[PDB]
Each structure stands twice: as structure tokens, then as C-alpha cells.
Design a protein around this ligand. Structure first.
Ligand SMILES: CC(=O)c1cccc(N2C[C@@H](C(=O)N[C@@H](Cc3ccccc3)[C@H](O)CN(CC(C)C)S(=O)(=O)c3ccc4c(c3)OCO4)OC2=O)c1
Lengths: 99, 99
């Protein structure tokens, strides 16, 4: 589909048995999800934005469905107010910017 | 143009006769630029981000040419980690997400 930017580009994502709304975010290198207790190994990381940094947990090779498109990759879990689909997964679902 | 997301969508902008690099940021409501001088009246504002809240200066009806496309709108100036073009100006230049 084509998503205009009159409103926030929120879409439905699925990560295991959880459905969540998330931003398709071209300004995000990495995918950052709200606090959730995913299985498996992880490593701590800091990521920076407006207002400074948050601590996140980096999980690798996590499958996520984004509008029925399959993705799998690194997901950072931490105290974000919004779920953020970053470029690492946007490319996998064939997402481009156009003007 | 069409822009893929294997790299950061950085573009050259022209503002006040100055060329800067800025990130096309679909996850940002508002355009926020690093400290710079702009003429005219501004209003103090506070905005949120992943790391907390910051103080910015709000300038209205500022011309910016983004990758050759003309916008005239609100520019927030403050301690953003990088220059970001938000949805307020992305809509003006006709930017959409497609997959
Ligand atoms: C309540 C609140 O916080 C709020 C309210 C209204 C608006 C906003 N913001 C904040 C601003 C913003 O910072 N956007 C982020 C995504 C985001 C959206 C809402 C809340 C928090 C974060 C950017 O699109 C992406 N950020 C990086 C840019 C600033 C350069 S980031 O900090 O979220 C980020 C994401 C992934 C990352 C990363 C940093 O480093 C590596 O991977 O855009 C908004 O619309 C926040």
C-alpha cells in the first residue's frame, strides 16, 4: 500500500502472541519495542534520541509480522512510549520513501 | 525520487542560504534542527523524545528546500541529536511510504 504522512504511520505488528501498533519509522536505524518479556538471549545497549538515551535489551533473529509481511531481525526492547519499526525491518517488507 | 532504507535517508536541505544535512524521519511529528540562528520571532516550546523532554525554539513559516522541493512551515530549533525533517514538512513535499 501507500501510506501518507498526514497522520502518524502506525500499522499493526505481530510478535508472537502479541499484536501492537507501531510506527514505520525511517528515522530509526533499529527497531525499538515497548517493554515485553521475549524468550532467549539478549545483550544490553544504549540508544539515543531527543532528550537523551534509554537502556534497551537487544534480541536477535526475532520474527515479526508487519501488515502481513514477514520480517526477522534484531529487536531492541525498552522503555519507549511507542513501538518503532526501524530501517532494519522496513527494508525486509519492501518499504521505501517516495516524493 | 524513490529512497530505499538500507542507508539513513539523509538529504541536503537549504535554509536561510545555508546547506545542511537532515534525516527524513517519518516517526517525527515535527521538524527539529540543531542549534542555529534564524530571523524573526520565536516561541519557547518543549517537546518529548525517546530520552525525555527538551526545550526548543519554535519558528513559524520558515522556507526550507528539501532535496529540491519547497516547503514553508514550522521549524523547531534545539538539542536534537541530528537534524530531522518531520511529518509537518514531509507532507508538504509530498512524501509517502510505500511497500
Ligand atoms: C509523549 C512523547 O514522548 C511524544 C509526544 C509527541 C511527539 C513525540 N515525538 C518525538 C519525536 C521523535 O523523537 N521521534 C522518534 C520516534 C519516536 C516517536 C515518539 C516517541 C518517541 C520516539 C524518531 O522517529 C526516531 N528517533 C531517532 C531520531 C530522533 C533521530 S529515536 O530516538 O526514537 C530512535 C529510534 C531508533 C533508534 C535510535 C533512536 O537509535 C538507534 O535506533 O517525534 C515525535 O512525534 C513524542
Amino acid at each position: 500500500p501507500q501510506i501518507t504522512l498526514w497522520k502518524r504511520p502506525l500499522v499493526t505488528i505481530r510478535i508472537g502472541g502479541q499484536l501492537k501498533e507501531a510506527l514505520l519509522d525511517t528515522g530509526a536505524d533499529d527497531t525499538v519495542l515497548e517493554e515485553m518479556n521475549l524468550p532467549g538471549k539478549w545483550k544490553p545497549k544504549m540508544i539515543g534520541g531527543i532528550g537523551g538515551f534509554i537502556k534497551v535489551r537487544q534480541y536477535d533473529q526475532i520474527p515479526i509480522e508487519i501488515c502481513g509481511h514477514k520480517a526477522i531481525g534484531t529487536v531492541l526492547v525498552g522503555p519507549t512510549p511507542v513501538n518503532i519499526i526501524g530501517r532494519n525491518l522496513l527494508t525486509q517488507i519492501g518499504c521505501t520513501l517516495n516524493f
